[PDB]
């Protein structure tokens, strides 16, 4: 019988005691988030701090996907703005950073 309305279900349900096992994979052990977290001082890129806040690797496969999408602005954000946004001064005459 349907629990919401109490109406009988047109189809009869196969029901019975079956031995179930709970696996060690809990969601609380896998959920993680990263938003402006700790970065490596040498690499100036994301790394885990005191949690799993290290971010997701935006690998070659994701870059190729975003290239196919043509989302050059989002591609730039993920590969630059979201990882190591930096600016340097460069000389126009010698092209070297000043």
């Amino acid at each position: 019988y349907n629990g919401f309305t109490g109406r009988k279900i047109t189809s009869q349900i196969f029901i019975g005691p079956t031995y179930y096992q709970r696996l060690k994979h809990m969601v609380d052990d896998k959920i993680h988030s990263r938003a402006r977290g700790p970065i490596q001082i040498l690499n100036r890129q994301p790394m885990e701090g005191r949690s799993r806040d290290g971010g997701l690797r935006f690998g070659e496969m994701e870059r190729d996907c975003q290239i196919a999408h043509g989302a050059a602005q989002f591609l730039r954000e993920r590969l630059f703005e979201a990882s190591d946004p930096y600016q340097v001064h460069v000389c126009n005459l010698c092209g070297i950073m000043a």
Binding site: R22, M26, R52
Partner: protein, 134 residues
Amino acid sequence: SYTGYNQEDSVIMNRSAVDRGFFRSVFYRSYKEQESKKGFDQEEVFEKPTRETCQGMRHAIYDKLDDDGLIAPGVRVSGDDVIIGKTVTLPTKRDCSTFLRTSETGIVDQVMVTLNQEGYKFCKIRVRSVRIPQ
């Protein structure tokens, strides 16, 4: 096919059974720490850091630690809490306390102190976290 929440290998569970303890479990995570005097200039030891003892300390509460620098059993812990207060002598003394991860939230189940294979003061802290099916 009860309302589609079990589609693609998903399962729908009876919340009342879970409330009755169906598949409820306990997760025990054991943290081990030792104090080693390798290098005469450095001497790490278990003791709760104090404002006068350490030149710099965070606003984080160390109240969970006992005078021996170890948390007692039956105390709730989280990522904001310290389970072990360890301080190393500088070449003032620096603090090297052991904090839990933000995901680690439970109650200290047991805390044992011993001398390990190296003969150094050694301790194991078992944290009990109860995992309700969700």
